[PDB]
């Protein structure tokens, strides 16, 4: 058995993310860029609102686990400026060879997201925690 609390709202909707961004990470050679453009944003949509649940959480915090949040917060909006960039750069109606490594770079990007998520996860369950033992 085991007895456990969910207490942080943090870690629960970033799990979203890093799985609709996973699933475009295998399906990249499978479907075509045209069908991601709109996957990008349910996987770009997840952090955004999330985002904005730690924030609440950063003045209640102390001064050491900040530069996760509010260093994580802000870098959880590049790791899609890159992945979208690509998409209307890959898509794009390109003839050259590089339209091939166009397309496995923007996934590279992809995984950024849930990558950056994972240590966000972690990184407020230790300031949410710090809350209460401090005064």
């Known amino acids: ?11 629960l909707n970033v799990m979203e993310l890093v799985r609709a961004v996973l699933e475009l990470k295998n399906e990249l050679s499978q479907l075509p ?12 949509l997840t952090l955004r609102k999330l985002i904005g649940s730690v924030d609440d959480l950063l003045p209640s915090l102390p ?9 994580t ?10 992945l979208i960039n690509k998409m209307r750069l890959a898509q794009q109606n390109a003839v050259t060879s590089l339209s091939e490594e166009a397309k496995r770079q923007m ?9 950056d998520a994972k240590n966000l996860l972690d990184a407020v369950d230790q300031a ?8």
């Open 63 to 71: 001064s050491s686990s900040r530069t996760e949040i509010e260093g």
């Open 73 to 82: 917060q802000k870098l959880l909006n590049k790791d899609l400026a890159e």
């Open 107 to 115: 996934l590279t990007a992809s995984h950024t997201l849930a990558v």
């Open 128 to 135: 949410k925690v710090l809350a209460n033992l401090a005064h």
């Open 33 to 44: 860029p045209e069908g991601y453009v709109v996957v990008v944003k349910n996987v770009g």
């Open 1 to 11: 058995a085991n007895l456990d609390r969910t207490d942080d709202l943090v870690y």
